[PDB]
Amino acid sequence: IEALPTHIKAQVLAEALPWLKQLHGKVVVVKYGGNAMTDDTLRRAFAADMAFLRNCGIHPVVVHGGGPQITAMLRRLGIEGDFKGGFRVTTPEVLDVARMVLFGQVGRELVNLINAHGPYAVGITGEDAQLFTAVRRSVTVDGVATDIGLVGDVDQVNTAAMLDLVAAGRIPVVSTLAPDADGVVHNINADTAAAAVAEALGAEKLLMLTDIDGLYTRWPDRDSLVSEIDTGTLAQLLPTLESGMVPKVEACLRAVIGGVPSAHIIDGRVTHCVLVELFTDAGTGTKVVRG
Template sequence: MDLHGRTMVIRVDEATLGAEGGTFFSDLVFLGNLGMRPVVVAPTADAARAVVRSMNRSGDAAVGLSGADAGMIPAAAGTIGAVQTKLLTTLLDAGYVPVIEPLAFGFTGTDVAVAADDVAQALASAVGAARAIFFNDRGGVIDAKTQLLVDQLTPAEALAVADDTTLGEDLRAAVRAAALGVRGGVGAAQICDGRVAHAAIVEFLTARHLGTQVAGTVYMG
């Protein structure tokens, strides 16, 4: 699949950002140079601002956004409403890398903190991302019987995994978001450890999976 000109959504976590000798920022530069259009979703507002500063120091043209900017991510009864993509598309078309704070626009006057995994899923579905990646320090889904990493799941299988309360809530959230993203039209979604060298490049550009990929039947809706 030719990914030139296609949008990639990357949900980065604190472990990846804090990794000594990590390649996350250089990987973003590399993907951008190949003509891909990365969108970064940060775990917190402070992390988003730190990512923007780091990227701009390295020569990337990053722009920090809150989900409340231009009403891009509206809050809706404890969840996320229909994402407004105009601002995001404008920045991507101009060559910027949007870095998103996990905050939704509250119509009652108070903006609402929302889970970064949910933001990444909603954005990826709304822009028709070719790929989404959810960095998680657990590295993916481990098969309970074999204790081996699960290479691939269908969205239905991933949703079943996300209901397994023996797993950590952070991993369950990432798996659920990956499954819903694929059902919403994302080409494929990966859950992997972003501290691994060049994780984004390996997941996006090779057939190898460092973690667990969710792909399969797509239900648009």
């Protein structure tokens, strides 16, 4: 961005205005995962972008996953896994590992990255201040609902405390573990949890960073990619899509149906993708709205 004429730099900065006005003082929940988490230039830029939102008076909330880091730690520890369908059964032991990795490893590096720009990030789980609870979930293998241990869905959210934390100028970085009604901590799918937090906080937008250009309807037809889609149309398309896009799309559906004005599936492999989706009309992501 050196040889680029100044008057076009001015135009790029000015074209941001309408979205600065749309998001000022608003909550934006961001699911962070995929390559945007593993490559150092992309993660450093993701951190700077969170600092950006905060220094525009926007209120980012970061929800993170970390599936592959968990299995690697379990393999390091020699913890033999049990599998039903494609799912590992989350025994009390896998959870102590899951929690320890998500919160004590993955969340910490993001906190430190963001905090390179200032005293902003704060890590939390649903355990802290009872910020959210979990309810045990089942999954379905070959059409049968089946138990795979201490996994669940976000049950209820301490909306008050949480919103406090962000008015103080803080960026929570959430690791998706929370207690159930009996105090038993469960692991929650990070995508679904992000949609739940977004809905409960009255978020203006939910962004889902993924390793895709965007929602393809008839993958892999190039002509099948779409910029925008409504819940009704997307819900009908849901049984058609690949394994990896189902949770991302399900989250977008529950968020937007829950009242979040729009959810976005954006490409985490693009540097500063969040700046592109939020402050530019040129994002390759796909925007979900109600209808």
